[PDB]
Amino acid sequence: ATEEAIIRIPPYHYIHVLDQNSNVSRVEVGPKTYIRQDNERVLFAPVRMVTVPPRHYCIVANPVSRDAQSSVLFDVTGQVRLRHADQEIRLAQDPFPLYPGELLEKDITPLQVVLPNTALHLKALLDFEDKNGDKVMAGDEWLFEGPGTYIPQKEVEVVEIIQATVIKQNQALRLRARKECFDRDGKERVTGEEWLVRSVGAYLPAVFEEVLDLVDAVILTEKTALHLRARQNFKDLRGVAHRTGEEWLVTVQDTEAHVPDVYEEVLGVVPITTLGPRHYCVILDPMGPDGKNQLGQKRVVKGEKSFFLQPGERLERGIQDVYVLSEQQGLLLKALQPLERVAHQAGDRWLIRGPLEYVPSAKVEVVEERQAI
């Protein structure tokens, strides 16, 4: 007795039988006691079927060609016809035998589980119809948010895993638009446009949203103000419009904490100019009603007032002391320009007697303080 005539095939096992005088190679399924014929030859002893457990998948190379009835199509000779070259993904299924030709390209591998607060970047490689009925085009990109289980498809690739970035109380997330997309607030964004997300908590970016850097809010104390300059034309969060190159200050009256926006540029922190009842100061190049510095002009501020120094402004002699006069104290004043107390012309000089809490204007100057008159 040359070869094995009777082969017992156990449950969930299979053998390949070749018909020698026709080259028809077929699969015989268990559990059955198979009797080999004189024209037949058994290729190998019964091997275990490819069992795919739940939560798992496998890839089969050169899969069997099947009709609408899922039944395996045969050749003109009776040979099982195979879809050569390409591959097929098979999920949790009843244990299946391998047909003559098809081979296990990838063994039993657990399905990719997506965690909460994470999403999968998915790009369509070729045209296909999805589960809903939508026609998906090659080049389309979308997300798959967890928790859940992703099922692999030959038409779709996994680009990357997106982790959601947590934003604290005094923080904001800077985003970049990769393509023409819509903001989470419902605002259309062009390619390369940047904006800030002021939402507190976990933030998962959209498909075309690129995460850049977390920006901390500058805490504004009563004595401090934020110096800012517009990088380009934009309208701020408060409502006031800003143009390229313009400079402005942000105080506590505006907000408790300010986050520097995309079109905002931080220049520094400006300390408050505090004055008492007996204090005054002169400001060079004061900002006009048009919002522009009056070059070569002077402004006098007095009488206990608290204010911030505007962009492009300077103090002439810091915090000056108000000229307090007694009944014997006097001041010799000189006019720098025509004045109007009787009117004074060019370089007129006059004496001012006390007692007076005197403060000189920009047009007058103090030459000498006289004592005991």
Side-chain angles (χ1 to χ4, degrees), residues 147-252:
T149 311
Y150 173 72
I151 300 161
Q153 200 183 1
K154 56 183 175 182
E155 287 86 7
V156 189
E157 68 162 31
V158 184
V159 182
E160 62 188 325
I161 319 294
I162 297 96
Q163 160 70 28
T165 310
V166 60
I167 311 161
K168 285 182 175 67
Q169 179 60 44
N170 298 322
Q171 283 189 333
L173 188 71
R174 195 193 192 98
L175 289 176
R176 175 89 67 85
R178 277 179 275 190
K179 287 184 180 184
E180 282 81 33
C181 62
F182 277 82
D183 196 15
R184 202 145 296 189
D185 299 307
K187 301 171 187 289
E188 198 168 50
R189 306 285 182 182
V190 292
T191 299
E193 198 185 330
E194 297 176 347
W195 67 99
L196 273 69
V197 178
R198 302 174 188 273
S199 299
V200 184
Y203 184 86
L204 186 79
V207 60
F208 298 112
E209 285 176 7
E210 185 194 347
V211 181
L212 289 164
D213 55 79
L214 282 154
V215 187
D216 287 292
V218 183
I219 311 298
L220 294 162
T221 323
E222 186 56 62
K223 297 182 287 294
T224 55
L226 191 71
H227 204 303
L228 291 168
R229 184 166 65 91
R231 312 186 96 108
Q232 66 178 54
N233 295 350
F234 83 107
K235 291 186 81 179
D236 76 336
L237 193 73
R238 300 189 303 272
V240 59
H242 304 283
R243 284 159 285 166
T244 319
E246 282 193 46
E247 293 168 313
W248 66 95
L249 297 168
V250 179
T251 57
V252 194

Side-chain angles (χ1 to χ4, degrees), residues 111-277 279-339 342-364:
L111 291 163
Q112 193 175 324
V113 57
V114 194
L115 298 165
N117 299 312
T118 54
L120 265 60
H121 202 126
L122 300 168
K123 190 173 80 181
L125 299 157
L126 58 149
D127 297 349
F128 74 99
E129 190 181 315
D130 69 344
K131 307 92 201 292
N132 296 306
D134 284 48
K135 296 163 282 181
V136 189
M137 200 193 296
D140 292 4
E141 288 179 38
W142 68 99
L143 255 55
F144 182 70
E145 190 178 13
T149 311
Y150 173 72
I151 300 161
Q153 200 183 1
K154 56 183 175 182
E155 287 86 7
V156 189
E157 68 162 31
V158 184
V159 182
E160 62 188 325
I161 319 294
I162 297 96
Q163 160 70 28
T165 310
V166 60
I167 311 161
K168 285 182 175 67
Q169 179 60 44
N170 298 322
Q171 283 189 333
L173 188 71
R174 195 193 192 98
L175 289 176
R176 175 89 67 85
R178 277 179 275 190
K179 287 184 180 184
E180 282 81 33
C181 62
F182 277 82
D183 196 15
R184 202 145 296 189
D185 299 307
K187 301 171 187 289
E188 198 168 50
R189 306 285 182 182
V190 292
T191 299
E193 198 185 330
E194 297 176 347
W195 67 99
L196 273 69
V197 178
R198 302 174 188 273
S199 299
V200 184
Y203 184 86
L204 186 79
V207 60
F208 298 112
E209 285 176 7
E210 185 194 347
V211 181
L212 289 164
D213 55 79
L214 282 154
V215 187
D216 287 292
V218 183
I219 311 298
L220 294 162
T221 323
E222 186 56 62
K223 297 182 287 294
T224 55
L226 191 71
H227 204 303
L228 291 168
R229 184 166 65 91
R231 312 186 96 108
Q232 66 178 54
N233 295 350
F234 83 107
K235 291 186 81 179
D236 76 336
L237 193 73
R238 300 189 303 272
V240 59
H242 304 283
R243 284 159 285 166
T244 319
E246 282 193 46
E247 293 168 313
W248 66 95
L249 297 168
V250 179
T251 57
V252 194
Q253 324 296 323
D254 295 299
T255 179
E256 290 276 10
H258 191 94
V259 199
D261 216 326
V262 49
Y263 313 123
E264 288 182 331
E265 187 182 28
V266 58
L267 268 68
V269 184
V270 181
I272 200 160
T273 313
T274 175
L275 297 164
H279 283 133
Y280 81 100
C281 67
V282 189
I283 307 163
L284 306 328
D285 301 341
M287 196 188 76
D290 44 31
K292 296 160 190 175
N293 298 313
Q294 303 174 65
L295 295 158
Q297 298 289 70
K298 291 177 186 182
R299 195 204 290 176
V300 184
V301 181
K302 61 142 176 289
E304 196 185 351
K305 207 184 86 179
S306 297
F307 71 98
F308 288 96
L309 200 55
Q310 299 284 317
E313 286 185 354
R314 290 164 284 99
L315 267 60
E316 194 169 30
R317 209 178 181 268
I319 304 95
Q320 296 172 238
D321 294 314
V322 167
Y323 289 92
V324 53
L325 285 84
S326 64
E327 289 196 54
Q328 290 186 21
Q329 286 183 315
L331 261 72
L332 184 68
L333 299 175
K334 187 193 172 185
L336 296 164
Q337 68 169 54
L339 270 140
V342 78
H344 300 280
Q345 287 167 305
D348 287 346
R349 290 199 290 264
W350 66 100
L351 185 71
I352 294 297
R353 282 166 157 266
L356 185 71
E357 201 178 48
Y358 177 78
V359 52
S361 62
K363 300 177 187 182
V364 288

